[PDB]
Write a protein that binds this ligand. Structure first.
Ligand SMILES: [Zn+2]
Ligand SMILES: [Zn+2]
Ligand SMILES: [Zn+2]
Lengths: 125, 1097, 40, 67, 142
């Protein structure tokens, strides 16, 4: 029964990730730390989905897409590999902000924003 | 053509490429190919303190091959090393980088000692020998290998099992000793062991490098966790029942007024021992005690004490759960909590410390030339290597041969690490392999480690164990098992973050006990939100072989954890994966497995079968047969009879017997005698019991097909009439046929070796072999009848009880010290071997042969634990006979069946009888075999009764017996316990020079001890002069001279402490009481005898 | 009970030490006691 | 190691029926139980003499001095 | 060498509450020999001057009398002294035709070392080979 309970809670976290992403739009300087895998597919050449599946950074932009499925779910695809997504850290209690460090002589701690939550993306093994 | 009963063919596919001695062979192959490098790299460089420029570093290492040689070196073959009493070994070629003069020089192929190599491993010459090369090298291809030949004696390193090393184990009892071990062991970077104990309801932290134990709140503050609310959130959570239990430990931190990590570290900085070298502060010490002193496998490297603080917090959460519920404790005897330490692991402990002590003793002699004169005369530093290279050889050889384990660096003093390989049977050589030792054999308890656990289903053999003083402390591994190989875990850790854990430095300590946390080898790593999706995607990476097999993941629920173990020494067991109620191995795969292609480990790569750990069997639900697969199953047994090991597969129909009976067979299959090897006539061993005409069992087993037992069997098929006869078979005695023994039923043969070494001495004089001593003409005297001209006895001649067969003489006078055959029966010389050992001195081994037949008193047994002795031998016209005229070879009493409940012996006889009438050998394999309802079909087909009961006539009176006699072939095996080697008797003989009582042992003249419990018996009879005679008059009587005024004992009728022979009385006394008094006078007490007259006046 | 002349309490201090007979400690190889007496 | 000359339970001579037992199985092949009856081993005490005989003299003779 | 290493492995051991450390060594580097041995003493213990006690107690005793109690103390320490040692030190030095000396003064320089019990120091001068062995045994207590 337990795999069904984690299915509906992921289904509960898929509406809960859509509200907290759409409400967060255009509220300035209010962030969300969210976890990607350490190694990404290559983009000078596209590593195909089953090849990135096997072995398991400077980039430009428009590297992926957060697709909203018609049924109830969401799935990040980057390049051509397809990942799955869930609000999967915890309901955090410790309060979180983001601070920019400056190296040597313009030395400043710029306070950017405040973390809403944390969502994770895993490869769809 | 293929069906549900054909998946057992994976078991010959498993054992083909693996074998049964792989836990010895793979470990030694791992050591000489991987772990030799990881010892050289751990201490590569030699630093000369005098002139810190003359360094010396070892580039790499290899055994048995020079780098310039394209071929492996010639080794003396393993059988020649048995005969010449050498050590079967191989040279360790290191090559070296050193400094000489003013430039550095590489030198190639320095031999540093010799490594005693295991048989059938990579460097052994028996590796891939095609059974015609075995014959040239005089080796048996059915020999298992897996052992060492050290000084001729073949020695096996047993499988040791320890408790699980780097994991947490919770104990408890009444009086509240809730202790928590964690025996930390990074190789010997540190070897440490912490505790956590509750005293007075207050949690402490004991460690053997601390003066007095630290409370628990001021040691998490010694780590980074100092907020003192999160300590109530790392060990309690939101559980209100646990917040009461830990709240006493909070205020104790305030009671010592400890509030910061600076002040917390300074508490334990003044509690340490072994302050030696640096004179650093208590801050610099207390921050070092958390670095690499308490939990040593979790070394910290920087400021972040987070995951180590989370370690001690998750230890003390398991304490608080144990205080609340006292049943949340860990079984110390559970098989998942064990690690099996194999032979490569032990030799890597041993070879490292000798290479430590090599490099220490080479450094303290590399400076004994530098600080001495002839400064300009440089030296190559490679001429003192052989000064200490005979300590690598002699320390490896001694520790295997003695079995002693003296490791100064590692601090372990284990005894009984090795054993001599047993050559009683073919089964003894294979039962001494697959054998597991334990740590409990120093201190005693009741009903703990001696009870078998249900967690050894398929992992350990459920019947092969000794009976008596070691029942359940020696144990045996099953057929389809595998011991896990230890592998790297930081690739496995980095796979966990990609699969969706988030790191322990990223997670809030408040909400940590709401999600399952993953545990890579007991260490908390992250916290997954969706665990069963994480576990399913980790099996799927293992079944596709991306991440390795022998990497087990299991999702606990009460701990709410997801454990991932990858360390070595776990016991796996292959199972067939089922999915959605359907076994994944279809009949197309068994069709491919039979006809050559797609072996075992193609069933692993293609995702069909799977190794399961003991722990991963919790997260499973395993079907036994294909008809039992319900949709909630997740595995299927390859074959259920592998619950039993190698020795317990000899039993026919074990599932019909009672279970203590199947355990007595395992001890007695190793004791039965038959064929040993194919070079059993080319070998000269200490005691070798053979059988003349051994037969393979009529009822056999799949398990003895696999281990090739029916090519070197130990026993004969006796015709057995189960009936009561002659009254000489009452309580386990068995009636025997005389005409069977005359034809060779049960007739055996003993072989014994005798080694003399003609040692040469420092006086340049040598032991010599004498000559034939004739008398009165050219014929020998009695003691030289079997001698021959060169003093070594002639091959084929009969030696008997007093003659000489090696006439050696020691020193030019020669003191004659020949060997004298002192046996109660004669024996023919069959093999005299003249050779020279390694140190160039003579070595004579003489083998002596003796034929012997069943006497009254030899032990026979069936394969059902029914040991028995021969009670009478009967003339064969006195035996009962059927219509065809068959008489039994053995008659067995019907009274050994009802109390012992061996119904599987009643099926061995019918399957044996129906099979021999059909012409086919039958099967009595466990949970299967041939069926009684169609063995009784073959048996009516001939015209015999279905039940195996025949109408026998009486041999004595001629008449029909009034019962039908259960009659047919049982396989009997003859044991080594023979009454010729057990009957002994002593009238008078040698006495021990101290106690002057008769000597000890059997192989002396003798002396039977009458001790402390039969003395009690004859006091109870009141027999007082027997007790006087049996204890004093005929054990140690001693006429002594006491003095009457002193009470001390004088010599020769003369007292010494008063110089007079005047009042000396002469008495008879036990000599042990004389020896007592003169040991009391030396301890400065004086037992003064007060005497008196016996007779009234 | 110092009526016996060995009663006296100073007889419990090792002034003199008896060397035991060689029957008590033989030599097969020196004995453990024989090597202790010489050391004393 | 080599075939017993006689059956143990009867004394029927079975040592001359090992060389001929292997020829009935190897050529003109039979199913090991009519090759016994063709040699004339009726009693089961005599059939078990050569059916469960493991012949070890052939393997022992591989390890002699070549001579 | 190897045999010298063996006979030094003999002479270094420790029993229950005693620790004996001594060895033998042979190297070529009665009026002129008085300075020839104090340099051996200085190199043997580089923390005490031995140019001070010049008219010392060199008991010029028989080497057979010396090896007698040198063997007796190995019986007395549970060692069972192995005889080949006395050929090995012969085989490098020609033990027969040589003279023995012994630094045993009234108060030796080890009485101030804590844990000192007794010593046995042997000098074996050679003439044809100039090979002096410095056989020394220092029994301590720990
Ligand atoms: Zn007296
Ligand atoms: Zn016969
Ligand atoms: Zn017969």
């Amino acid at each position: 029964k337990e795999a069904a309970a984690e299915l509906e809670l992921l289904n509960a976290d898929h509406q809960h990730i859509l509200r907290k992403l759409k409400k967060m739009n255009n509220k300035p300087e209010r962030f969300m730390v969210f976890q990607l895998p350490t190694r990404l597919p290559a983009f000078e050449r596209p590593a195909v989905k089953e090849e990135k599946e096997d072995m398991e950074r400077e980039l430009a932009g428009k590297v992926g897409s957060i697709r909203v499925h018609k049924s109830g779910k969401l799935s990040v695809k980057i390049g051509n590999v397809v990942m799955d997504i869930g609000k999967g850290a915890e309901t955090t209690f410790l309060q979180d902000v983001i601070a920019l460090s400056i190296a040597d002589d313009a030395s400043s701690a710029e306070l950017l924003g405040r973390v809403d939550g944390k969502i994770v993306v895993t490869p769809q093994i | 053509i293929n069906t549900a009963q054909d998946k057992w063919h994976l078991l010959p596919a498993f054992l083909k490429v693996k074998g049964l001695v792989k836990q010895h062979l793979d470990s030694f192959n791992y050591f000489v190919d991987t772990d030799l490098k990881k010892i050289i790299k751990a201490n590569q460089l030699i630093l000369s303190d005098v002139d810190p420029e003359f360094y010396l570093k070892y580039v790499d290492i290899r055994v048995g091959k020079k780098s310039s040689s394209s071929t492996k070196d010639y080794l003396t073959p393993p059988h020649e090393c048995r005969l010449r009493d050498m050590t079967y070994s191989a040279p360790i070629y290191v090559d070296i980088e050193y400094t000489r003069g003013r430039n550095i020089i590489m030198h190639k192929d320095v031999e540093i000692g010799r490594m005693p190599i295991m048989l059938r491993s990579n460097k052994c010459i028996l590796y891939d020998a095609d059974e015609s090369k075995m014959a040239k090298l005089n080796e048996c291809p059915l020999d298992p290998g897996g052992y060492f030949i050290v000084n001729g004696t073949e020695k096996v390193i047993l499988v040791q099992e320890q408790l699980s090393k780097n994991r947490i184990i919770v104990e408890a009892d009444e009086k509240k000793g809730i202790v928590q071990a964690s025996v930390t062991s990074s190789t010997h970077e540190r070897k440490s062991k912490t505790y956590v104990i509750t005293k007075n309801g207050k949690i402490y932290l004991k460690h053997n490098s601390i003066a007095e134990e630290i409370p628990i709140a001021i040691v998490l503050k010694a780590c980074g966790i100092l907020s003192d609310l999160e300590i109530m959130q790392l060990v309690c959570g939101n559980d209100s029942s646990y917040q009461d239990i830990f709240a006493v430990n909070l205020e104790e931190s305030s009671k010592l007024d400890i509030y910061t990590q600076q002040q917390a570290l300074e508490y334990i900085g003044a509690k340490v021992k072994t302050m030696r070298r640096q004179k650093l502060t208590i801050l610099q010490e207390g921050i070092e005690a958390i670095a690499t002193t308490v939990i040593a496998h979790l070394t910290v490297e920087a400021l972040d004490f987070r995951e180590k603080a989370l370690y001690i917090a998750m230890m003390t959460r398991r304490v608080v759960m144990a205080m609340y519920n006292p049943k949340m404790i860990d079984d110390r005897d559970y098989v998942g909590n064990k690690r099996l330490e194999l032979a490569g692991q032990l030799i890597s402990l041993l070879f490292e410390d000798l290479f430590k002590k090599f490099n220490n003793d080479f450094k303290l002699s590399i400076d004994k030339v530098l600080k001495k004169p002839n400064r300009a005369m440089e030296y190559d530093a490679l001429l003192s290597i052989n000064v200490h290279s005979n300590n690598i050889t002699s320390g490896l050889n001694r520790a295997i041969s003695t079995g002693n384990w003296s490791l100064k660096r590692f601090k372990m003093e284990r005894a009984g690490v090795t054993h001599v390989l047993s050559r009683l049977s073919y089964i003894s050589a294979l039962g001494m392999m697959t054998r597991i030792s334990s740590q409990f054999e120093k201190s005693r308890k009741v009903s703990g480690p001696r009870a078998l656990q249900p967690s050894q289903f398929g992992m350990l053999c459920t019947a092969d164990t000794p009976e008596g003083e070691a029942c359940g402390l020696v144990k045996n591994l099953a057929l389809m098992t595998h011991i896990t190989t230890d592998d790297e875990e930081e690739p496995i850790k980095k796979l966990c973050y990609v699969l969706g854990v988030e790191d322990i430095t990223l997670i809030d300590s408040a909400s940590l006990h709401l999600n399952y946390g993953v545990y890579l080898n007991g260490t908390l790593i992250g916290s997954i939100r969706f665990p069963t999706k994480f576990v399913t995607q980790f099996r799927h990476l293992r079944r596709t072989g991306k991440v390795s097999e022998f990497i087990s993941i299991y999702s606990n629920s009460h701990q709410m954890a997801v454990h991932i173990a990858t360390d070595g020494g776990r016991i796996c067991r292959p199972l067939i994966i089922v999915s959605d109620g359907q076994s994944r191995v279809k009949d197309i795969h068994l069709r491919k497995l039979l006809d050559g292609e797609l072996d075992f480990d193609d069933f692993l790569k293609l995702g069909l079968v799977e190794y399961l750990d003991v722990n991963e069997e919790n997260d499973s639900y395993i079907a036994l047969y294909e008809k039992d697969i319900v949709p909630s199953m997740t595995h299927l047994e390859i074959e259920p009879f592998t619950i039993l090991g190698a020795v317990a597969g000899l039993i026919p129909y074990p599932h019909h017997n009672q279970s203590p009976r199947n355990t007595y067979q395992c001890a007695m299959g190793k004791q039965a005698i038959g064929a040993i090897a194919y070079n059993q006539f080319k070998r000269i061993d200490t005691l070798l019991y053979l059988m003349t005409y051994p037969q393979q069992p009529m009822v056999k087993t799949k398990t003895i097909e696999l281990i090739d037992y029916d090519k070197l069997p130990a026993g004969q098929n006796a015709t057995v009439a189960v009936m009561s006869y002659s009254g000489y078979d009452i309580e386990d005695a068995l009636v025997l046929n005389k005409s069977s023994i005359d034809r060779g039923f049960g007739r055996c043969e003993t072989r014994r070796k005798t080694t003399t070494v003609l040692k040469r001495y420092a006086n340049h004089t040598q032991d010599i072999i004498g000559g034939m001593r004739v008398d009165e003409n050219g014929d020998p005297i009695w003691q030289h009848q079997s001698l021959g001209p060169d003093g070594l006895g002639e091959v084929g001649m009969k030696v008997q009880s007093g003659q000489i067969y090696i006439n050696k003489s020691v020193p030019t006078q020669y003191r004659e010290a020949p060997v004298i055959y002192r046996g109660p029966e004669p024996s023919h010389i069959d093999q005299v071997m003249m050779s020279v050992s390694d140190n160039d001195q003579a070595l004579i081994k003489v083998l002596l042969r003796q034929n012997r037949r069943p006497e009254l008193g030899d032990k026979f047994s069936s394969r059902h634990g029914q040991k028995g002795v021969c009670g009478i031998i009967v003339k064969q016209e006195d035996m009962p006979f059927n219509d065809q005229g068959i008489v039994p070879d053995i008659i067995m009493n019907p009274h050994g069946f009802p109390s012992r409940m061996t119904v599987g012996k009643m099926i061995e006889l019918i399957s044996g009888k129906a099979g021999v009438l059909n012409g086919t050998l039958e099967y009595g394999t466990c949970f299967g075999g041939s069926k009684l309802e169609d063995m009784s079909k073959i048996l009516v087909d001939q015209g015999f009764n279905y039940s195996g009961k025949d109408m026998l006539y009486s041999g004595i009176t001629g008449e029909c017996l009034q019962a039908y006699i259960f009659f047919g072939p049982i396989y009997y095996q003859k044991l080594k316990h023979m009454v010729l080697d057990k009957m002994h008797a002593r009238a008078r003989g040698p006495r021990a020079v101290l106690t002057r009582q008769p000597t000890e042992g059997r192989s002396r003249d003798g002396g039977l001890r009458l001790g402390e419990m039969e003395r009690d018996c004859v006091i109870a009879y009141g027999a007082s002069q027997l007790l006087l005679e049996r204890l004093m008059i005929s054990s140690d009587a001693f006429e002594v001279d006491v003095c009457d005024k002193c009470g001390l004992m004088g010599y020769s009728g003369w007292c010494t402490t008063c110089k007079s022979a005047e009042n000396i009385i002469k008495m008879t006394i036990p000599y042990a009481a004389k020896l007592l008094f003169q040991e009391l006078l030396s301890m400065n007490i004086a037992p003064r005898l007060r005497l008196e007259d016996i007779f009234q006046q | 009970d110092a009526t016996v002349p060995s009663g006296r309490p100073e007889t419990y201090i090792w002034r003199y030490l008896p060397a035991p007979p060689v029957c008590i400690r033989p030599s097969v190889n020196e004995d453990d006691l024989t090597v202790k007496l010489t050391e004393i | 190691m080599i075939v017993p000359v006689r059956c143990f339970s009867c004394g029927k001579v079975v040592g001359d029926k090992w060389e001929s037992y292997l020829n009935l199985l190897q050529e003109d092949e039979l199913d090991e139980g009519t090759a016994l009856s063709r040699l004339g081993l009726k009693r089961y005490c005599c059939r078990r003499m050569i059916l469960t005989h493991v012949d070890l003299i052939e393997k022992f003779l591989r390890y002699n001095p070549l001579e | 060498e190897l045999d010298i290493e063996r006979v030094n492995q003999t002479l270094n051991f420790e029993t229950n509450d005693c620790k004996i450390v001594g060895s033998c060594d042979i190297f070529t580097t009665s009026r002129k020999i008085f300075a020839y041995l104090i340099a051996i003493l200085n190199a043997s213990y580089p923390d005490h001057d031995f140019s001070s006690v010049e008219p010392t107690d060199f008991v010029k005793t028989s080497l057979k009398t010396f090896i007698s109690k040198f063997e007796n103390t190995l019986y007395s320490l549970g060692r069972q002294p192995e005889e080949w040692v006395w050929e090995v030190i012969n085989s490098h030095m020609t033990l027969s035709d040589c003279v023995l000396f012994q630094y045993s003064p009234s108060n030796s320089f080890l009485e101030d070392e804590p844990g000192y019990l007794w010593n046995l120091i042997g000098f074996l001068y050679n003439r044809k080979r100039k090979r002096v062995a410095y056989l020394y045994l220092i029994c301590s207590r720990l």
